[PDB]
Design a protein around this ligand. Structure first.
Ligand SMILES: NCc1ccccn1
Ligand SMILES: NCc1ccccn1
Ligand SMILES: [Mg+2]
Length: 124
């Protein structure tokens, strides 16, 4: 089963802005070093390995972000954003990580800015 979280649906954020996305809806853009977004109430119904996909774009090299649960109580890992050659040239990167069942605040934190994100998809 899959859960799709629209990236623009965050409850809290720092130093980002929403913009119309070429794939419909909105994406988060104007992401800098130290920008972040937080999504409450993300349910992982079983304990085990999940695929977490990120629909991202960048016209530059080096965009990088970390994902975490509960404000860094559990770090899930870090994602590099490819240089897809345009701000609306989208691609899907992923991480495979182990989470125990629960409902968590899910956080994305920009280590190196210059990347956009459309959505997050979680699959077990
Ligand atoms: N965990 C992403 C984040 C960072 C700072 C504050 C809230 N959430
Ligand atoms: N050059 C646009 C931009 C601004 C802030 C963050 C990332 N890209
Ligand atoms: Mg979106």
């Amino acid at each position: 089963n899959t859960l799709k979280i629209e990236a623009e649906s965050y409850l809290y954020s720092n130093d980002v802005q929403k913009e119309p996305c070429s794939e419909g809806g909105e994406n988060v853009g104007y992401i800098n070093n130290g920008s972040w977004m937080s999504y409450p109430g993300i349910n992982f119904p079983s304990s085990g390995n999940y695929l977490i996909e990120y629909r991202v774009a960048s016209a530059v090299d080096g965009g990088r972000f970390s994902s975490d649960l509960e404000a860094g109580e559990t770090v899930l890992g870090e994602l590099s954003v490819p240089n897809t050659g345009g701000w609306q040239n989208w691609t899907t990167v992923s991480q495979t990580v182990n989470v125990s069942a629960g409902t968590y605040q899910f956080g994305l934190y920009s280590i190196s800015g210059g990347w956009n994100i459309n959505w997050i998809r979680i699959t077990k």
